[PDB]
Ligand binder design. Structure first.
Ligand SMILES: COc1cc(Nc2ncc(F)c(Nc3ccc4c(n3)NC(=O)C(C)(C)O4)n2)cc(OC)c1OC
Length: 268
């Protein structure tokens, strides 16, 4: 998990900013090859957040989840991860409005596979949104930003807690309870975003207005050109009662089946 600072090269080209510090592009010398990396570089709390994030990613091993290369203490604390070259899913779709329907289904299904793995691993993401799905290629998506993520206790299926309200299930808002099912709810908002080509959900509404809207049984409308089968899945993800809402196993299967229908139809 601990990396050799001299084996790491940093570019001055920035990928993002925040109170934590900056994320920059770089290269790390592996056993024989050079690997392109994204490096989170810190500006006590911030450090322990970083180490907790690192410790979560250290446990995870999946094609559809950004990999950690390791960590590094030097000028600042550094978290070195594999680079997703195409950037965040929302910005991508905003900038490429001609991405096809089969292709969006393919990506969101890839996210359901990453999330199925995380459910199986008993981790809650807690920040699953299109901004946190990074593209390796136009046909290869990975889940990132595990800064809010939690390993679940062996005896509990939920974690008890500024919040991204628009992606949050009622039980999170009302009882501060975050489970894989509440991640499923975010996945539904994430789906809406992807079929809206990266538009913010609940446009023009404040967090409390959204809460009031959902409480009243109201949901976001079908995005233009979204297949009814995919909008149905969004709504199913938006099931108020945690206990009736599907888990990622069922969600991923629904998406898998439908993608193969669209893959089949294309050939016909
Ligand atoms: C090539 O263009 C881009 C590429 C990437 N690739 C990429 N791969 C793996 C990663 F771990 C990674 N991490 C990362 C990067 C930046 C960040 C954050 N994380 N976190 C943040 O809170 C904000 C969002 C503040 O800045 N980025 C991300 C882009 O934005 C996330 C982007 O657009 C600039």
């Amino acid at each position: 998990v601990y990396l050799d600072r001299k084996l790491l090269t940093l570019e001055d080209k920035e990928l993002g900013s925040g109170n934590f510090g900056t994320v920059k592009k770089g290269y790390y010398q592996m056993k024989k090859v050079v690997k392109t990396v994204a490096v989170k570089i810190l500006k006590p709390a911030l450090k322990d957040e970083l180490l907790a994030e690192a410790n979560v990613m250290q446990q995870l091993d999946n094609p559809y989840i950004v990999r950690m290369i390791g960590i590094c203490e030097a000028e600042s604390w550094m978290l070195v991860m594999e680079m997703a070259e195409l950037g965040p899913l929302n910005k991508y779709l905003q900038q490429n409005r001609h991405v096809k329907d089969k292709n969006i289904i393919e990506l969101v299904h890839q996210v359901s596979m990453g999330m199925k793995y995380l459910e199986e691993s008993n981790f809650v993401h807690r920040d699953l949104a299109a901004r946190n799905v990074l593209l390796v290629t136009q046909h290869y998506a990975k889940i990132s930003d595990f800064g809010l993520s939690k390993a679940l206790r062996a005896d509990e299926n939920y974690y008890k807690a500024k919040w991204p309200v628009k992606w949050y299930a009622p039980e999170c808002i009302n009882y501060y309870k975050f489970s894989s099912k509440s991640d499923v709810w975010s996945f539904g908002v994430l789906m809406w975003e992807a079929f809206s080509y990266g538009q913010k959900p609940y446009r023009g509404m404040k967090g409390s207005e959204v809460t009031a809207m959902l409480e009243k049984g109201e949901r976001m409308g079908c995005p233009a050109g979204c297949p009814r089968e995919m909008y149905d899945l969004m709504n199913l993800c938006w099931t108020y009662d945690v206990e009736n809402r599907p888990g990622f196993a069922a969600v991923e299967l629904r998406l898998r089946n439908y993608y193969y229908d669209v893959v089949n139809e294309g050939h016909h």
